[PDB]
């Protein structure tokens with residue numbers, strides 16, 4: 001007897017594709033790699049309980065290729081497997097509301113993700129892939145498992161791998177509309193003179209070398225190709241926020257002078273991130289953990305600042 005059930009395949013979990021599957025063959029024999037809300041059913045034969053459910057598959061016809069690219073903005077053939085493999089884990093994570101923000105209870109070295117997710121909720125940023133727009137909306141309401149799985153997939157990180165917040169923010173910014181952001185810098189060398197540079201997009205909102213936005217406006221010392229020390233300072237800035245990053249160092253965070261910041265304790269390959277947010281006082285969010293203080297000092301590695309338009313007075 002040949003038995004069949006009706007199921008739906010998908011790449012974006014919105015547009016469904018009707019399939020009648022033979023229950024005597026695995027999903028893999030019929031669709032290739034097949035996933036049920038994260039679980040790999042490629043080697044499973046259809047159950048009766050599967051009738052009417054949706055399965056993710058690879059984009060193995062033109063319709064699915066277009067649906068997949070329009071939704072995810074990637075054509076990495078390995079994305080689906082990485083996304084599903086992460087989602088199996090992030091579905092089991094907990095997403096507490098901490099001081100009104102969606103956080104992540106610690107698991108699987110996910111501190112860098114919690115700090116990034118907390119940061120996102122405090123800066124103005126619109127994602128370009130509908131997949132991130134949709135999942136981020138749900139993350140803000142507290143159901144962040146799909147968003148975290150997507151971030152892991154876009155960043156090419158596996159669950160358990162310790163990521164870097166700055167790197168993660170860079171990936172997130174690459175998938176956001178920052179076309180309006182503009183930065184103008186001046187570099188002054190006593191030997192070589194002045195050199196002005198204009199940066200746009202992601203490069204206009206990220207800096208590596210100093211944590212202080214004020215010091216960046218005043219001027220920072222950097223090597224010149226002639227061997228001497230040159231001074232670089234901020235000429236103009238058009239963006240809704242800036243990110244200042246630096247190798248972890250003892251740094252003093254003052255209430256009201258910044259938006260939020262990343263603290264990193266440990267060494268290059270192994271450590272722990274914490275998040276500091278400046279509200280009515282200074283709150284330190286460490287996954288599900290929350291403490292408060294009037295002053296904060298610790299190994300800070302990223303600081304976020306609000307911005308709209310800045311123009312130097314340095315002549």
Ligand SMILES: O=Cc1ccc(O)cc1
Pocket residue numbers: 010011012056057058059068069072074075076079080083
């Ligand atoms: O390219 C991303 C992608 C995501 C889910 C799929 O089912 C297939 C492709």
Ligand SMILES: [Cl-]
Pocket residue numbers: 043044045046
């Ligand atoms: Cl089976």
Ligand SMILES: [Cl-]
Pocket residue numbers: 097098099100101
């Ligand atoms: Cl709350």
Ligand SMILES: [Cl-]
Pocket residue numbers: 125126127132133136
């Ligand atoms: Cl968005």
Ligand SMILES: [Cl-]
Pocket residue numbers: 091142143144145146
């Ligand atoms: Cl969730």
Ligand SMILES: [Cl-]
Pocket residue numbers: 162163164165167168
């Ligand atoms: Cl990383």
Ligand SMILES: [Cl-]
Pocket residue numbers: 073128129174175176
């Ligand atoms: Cl994008």
Ligand SMILES: [Cl-]
Pocket residue numbers: 174178179200201202203
């Ligand atoms: Cl950009």
Ligand SMILES: [Cl-]
Pocket residue numbers: 256257258259304305306
């Ligand atoms: Cl600020």
Ligand SMILES: [K+]
Pocket residue numbers: 173174175176177178179201
């Ligand atoms: K962009």
Ligand SMILES: [K+]
Pocket residue numbers: 179201
């Ligand atoms: K662009």
Ligand SMILES: [Zn+2]
Pocket residue numbers: 189190191192193224225226227228230
């Ligand atoms: Zn020089």
